[PDB]
Design an enzyme around this catalytic site. Structure first.
Site, short mmCIF file in Angstrom:
data_model
loop_
_atom_site.label_atom_id
_atom_site.label_comp_id
_atom_site.label_asym_id
_atom_site.label_seq_id
_atom_site.Cartn_x
_atom_site.Cartn_y
_atom_site.Cartn_z
N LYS A 118 0.83 -1.17 -0.07
CA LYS A 118 -0.05 0.01 -0.15
C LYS A 118 0.75 1.36 0.01
O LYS A 118 0.21 2.19 -0.35
CB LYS A 118 -0.88 0.01 1.09
N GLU A 120 15.43 -9.21 2.71
CA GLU A 120 15.50 -10.76 2.54
C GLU A 120 14.52 -11.03 1.58
O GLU A 120 13.39 -10.43 1.51
CB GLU A 120 15.37 -11.42 3.70
N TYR A 121 15.01 -11.94 0.49
CA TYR A 121 13.84 -12.13 -0.67
C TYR A 121 13.09 -13.31 -0.17
O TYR A 121 13.83 -14.29 0.22
CB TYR A 121 14.38 -12.19 -1.93
N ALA A 122 11.79 -13.39 -0.40
CA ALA A 122 11.09 -14.72 -0.02
C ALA A 122 10.47 -15.52 -1.15
O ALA A 122 9.31 -15.20 -1.70
CB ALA A 122 10.16 -14.45 1.20
N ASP A 141 0.18 -5.18 13.92
CA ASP A 141 -0.67 -5.69 12.91
C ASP A 141 -0.05 -6.79 11.99
O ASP A 141 0.60 -6.50 10.92
CB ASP A 141 -1.55 -4.72 12.04
N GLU A 143 -0.99 -11.19 4.68
CA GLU A 143 -0.17 -10.37 3.64
C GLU A 143 1.22 -10.15 3.89
O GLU A 143 2.03 -10.16 3.31
CB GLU A 143 -0.89 -8.99 3.57
N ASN A 144 1.47 -10.28 5.19
CA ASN A 144 2.46 -9.92 5.86
C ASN A 144 3.56 -11.20 6.24
O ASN A 144 4.28 -11.33 7.16
CB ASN A 144 2.56 -9.12 7.32
O1 LIG Z 1 6.17 -1.65 4.42
C1 LIG Z 1 6.85 -1.68 5.42
N1 LIG Z 1 7.06 -0.81 6.21
C2 LIG Z 1 6.34 0.19 6.09
C3 LIG Z 1 6.23 0.83 4.64
C4 LIG Z 1 5.82 2.20 4.37
C5 LIG Z 1 5.36 3.04 5.33
C6 LIG Z 1 5.38 2.40 6.69
C7 LIG Z 1 6.15 1.21 7.08
N2 LIG Z 1 7.46 -2.91 5.77
C8 LIG Z 1 7.06 -4.03 4.87
C9 LIG Z 1 6.02 -4.71 4.51
C10 LIG Z 1 5.93 -5.48 3.57
C11 LIG Z 1 7.14 -6.00 3.25
C12 LIG Z 1 6.94 -7.25 2.14
C13 LIG Z 1 7.43 -6.95 0.70
N3 LIG Z 1 7.28 -8.05 -0.29
C14 LIG Z 1 8.46 -9.07 -0.10
N4 LIG Z 1 9.53 -8.89 0.29
C15 LIG Z 1 10.55 -9.93 0.48
N5 LIG Z 1 10.48 -10.69 -0.66
C16 LIG Z 1 9.31 -11.05 -1.27
O2 LIG Z 1 8.92 -11.96 -2.20
C17 LIG Z 1 7.72 -11.62 -2.45
C18 LIG Z 1 7.03 -12.42 -3.58
C19 LIG Z 1 5.78 -11.75 -4.28
C20 LIG Z 1 5.16 -12.44 -5.28
C21 LIG Z 1 5.72 -13.79 -5.30
C22 LIG Z 1 6.61 -14.54 -5.10
C23 LIG Z 1 7.42 -13.66 -3.76
C24 LIG Z 1 7.28 -10.45 -2.16
C25 LIG Z 1 5.95 -9.89 -2.23
C26 LIG Z 1 5.94 -8.59 -2.66
C27 LIG Z 1 4.73 -7.81 -2.87
C28 LIG Z 1 3.62 -8.49 -2.62
C29 LIG Z 1 3.59 -9.93 -1.91
C30 LIG Z 1 4.82 -10.63 -1.90
C31 LIG Z 1 8.27 -10.11 -1.05
C32 LIG Z 1 8.42 -5.64 3.56
C33 LIG Z 1 8.36 -4.53 4.28
#
Ligand SMILES: O=C(Nc1ccccc1)Nc1ccc(CCNc2ncnc3oc(-c4ccccc4)c(-c4ccccc4)c23)cc1
EC number: 2.7.11.1
Length: 256
Positions: free
Chosen positions: A18, A86-88, A131, A135-136
């Protein structure tokens, strides 16, 4: 360690968050694969969340656990902030839910264990993840669950928030146990226990702790969920009681 955009080759979009998009990327010198999240300076100010992100970054680089997603670092140019992640490979549990509809008791219990451990380690380090939602929750190469996004941590859809937090009240680590209950229910039932079509009404359900179980949900599962989803924080289990739990242990593949 101070990075810049030209350090990396940008890869495919992984999806929208988002507050930003995510890309596969690869540090040129080492050929290390990782995720990179592109956030905008402007959108971040407007919502007043810039200080929120600093909190996260700070919090994240204090943390290390096999089931928590690493943040390697951050950096900005003019227009935007970049999170080096880190990539997942296996994506979200959210996606696995839609793909599979619902999880069996074995996958459910294993995730709860992995979450509890991860959550248990966080608490010992005075940190609460306000939270947590599917999604997380990312998956690693071996299929390990990895919690992402501490940006809300301390000390939008309401489905995963406990009463204390929505009632505008005071909240402690007991928040996360509510989140375990909601997640546990959702894994098995295939949708979250308070789910509604309005915010105002999901609000009521959560506030009253108003949920029922489909008939294919075993007593053991009901027992744990019933114990986690308590209106009064102080009545909720210890993270270890969860890890002890005879339905957790009978079912779960991972240690504690
Ligand atoms: O966003 C914040 N903090 C924050 C940001 C803005 C304002 C305030 C706080 N923290 C935050 C939140 C969420 C993330 C996760 C980022 N996705 C990821 N991070 C790392 N590896 C990943 O691998 C994948 C992946 C996606 C699809 C298929 C295969 C793999 C993702 C992924 C990315 C978007 C949507 C769904 C999954 C992914 C990382 C950090």
């Amino acid at each position: 360690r101070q990075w810049a955009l030209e350090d990396f080759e940008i890869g495919r979009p992984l999806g929208k968050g988002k507050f930003g998009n995510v890309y596969l990327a690869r540090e040129k010198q080492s050929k290390f694969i990782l995720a990179l999240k592109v956030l905008f300076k402007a959108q971040l100010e407007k919502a007043g969340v810039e200080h929120q992100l600093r909190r996260e970054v700070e919090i994240q680089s204090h943390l290390r656990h096999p089931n928590i997603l690493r943040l390697y670092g951050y950096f900005h140019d003019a227009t935007r902030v970049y999170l080096i992640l880190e990539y997942a490979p296996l994506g979200t549990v959210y996606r696995e839910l839609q793909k599979l509809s619902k999880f069996d008791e074995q996958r459910t219990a294993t995730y709860i264990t992995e979450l509890a451990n991860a959550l248990s380690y966080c608490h010992s380090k005075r940190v609460i993840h306000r939270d947590i939602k599917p999604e997380n929750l990312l998956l690693g190469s071996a299929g390990e669950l990895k919690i992402a996004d501490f940006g809300w941590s301390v000390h939008g859809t309401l489905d995963y928030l406990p009463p204390e937090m929505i009632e505008g009240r005071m909240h402690d680590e007991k928040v996360d146990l509510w989140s375990l209950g909601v997640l546990c229910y959702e894994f098995l039932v295939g949708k979250p226990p308070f789910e509604a079509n309005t915010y105002q009404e999901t609000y009521k359900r959560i506030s009253r702790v108003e949920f029922t179980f489909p008939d294919f949900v075993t007593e053991g599962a009901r027992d744990l969920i019933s114990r986690l989803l308590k209106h009064n924080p102080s009545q909720r289990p210890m993270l270890r009681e969860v890890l002890e739990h005879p339905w957790i242990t009978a079912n779960s593949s991972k240690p504690s």
